[PDB]
Amino acid sequence: RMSMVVSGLTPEEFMLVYKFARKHHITLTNLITEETTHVVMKTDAFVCEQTLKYFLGIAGGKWVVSYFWVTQSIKERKMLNEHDFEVRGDVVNGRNHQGPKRARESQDRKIFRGLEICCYGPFTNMPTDQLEWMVQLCGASVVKELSSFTLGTGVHPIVVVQPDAWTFHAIGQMCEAPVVTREWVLDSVALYQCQELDTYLIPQIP
Numbered sequence: 001r002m003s004m005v006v007s008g009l010t011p012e013e014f015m016l017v018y019k020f021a022r023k024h025h026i027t028l029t030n031l032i033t034e035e036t037t038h039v040v041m042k043t044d045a046f047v048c049e050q051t052l053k054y055f056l057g058i059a060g061g062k063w064v065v066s067y068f069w070v071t072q073s074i075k076e077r078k079m080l081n082e083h084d085f086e087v088r089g090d091v092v093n094g095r096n097h098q099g100p101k102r103a104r105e106s107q108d109r110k111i112f113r114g115l116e117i118c119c120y121g122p123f124t125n126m127p128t129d130q131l132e133w134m135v136q137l138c139g140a141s142v143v144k145e146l147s148s149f150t151l152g153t154g155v156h157p158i159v160v161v162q163p164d165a166w167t168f169h170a171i172g173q174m175c176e177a178p179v180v181t182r183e184w185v186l187d188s189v190a191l192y193q194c195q196e197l198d199t200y201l202i203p204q205i206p
């Protein structure tokens, strides 16, 4: 059926989403899972901030809708079309990138289709497993150890790092993979278009 989480709301706002869920028989949870069908984002009059629920929502090719879907569907005393409320973008990667949509329609051709990714080093605003979960949803295959990369010529390995979380340009010294920054993933995921690694490469010492 339907299952929702919310992002960037206030309790009153949440109250409304509840009221909405209550009336329409929609399941409403604190945590996002595979089952979650909808992510309701606080937006301007339809840009939201980039939250984790925001990313995993796109990663799952789910319904990433602005809070206005809710308040209107209450105002109209009926449930409107997820289609005319969607999140057209966000502050970070442009107010007009249509990420979520792209994501819904692209469930065959996933941006990280046929990749091997190792989220290496420590991470901040994201549990690594969540970052990892993210990339699995985008058709990447997760590696956990630099040295566990597959030898098949067909596959492409990538080391993802978040430089902030350290006290690491020697990666290229420990394997033969490109090193990029978490922004690569994030940026790729919002836009749902696998980015030119170029911008994101980290210097690897010989």
Ligand code: NI
Pocket (backbone or CB within 6 Å): 156
């Ligand atoms: Ni190649």
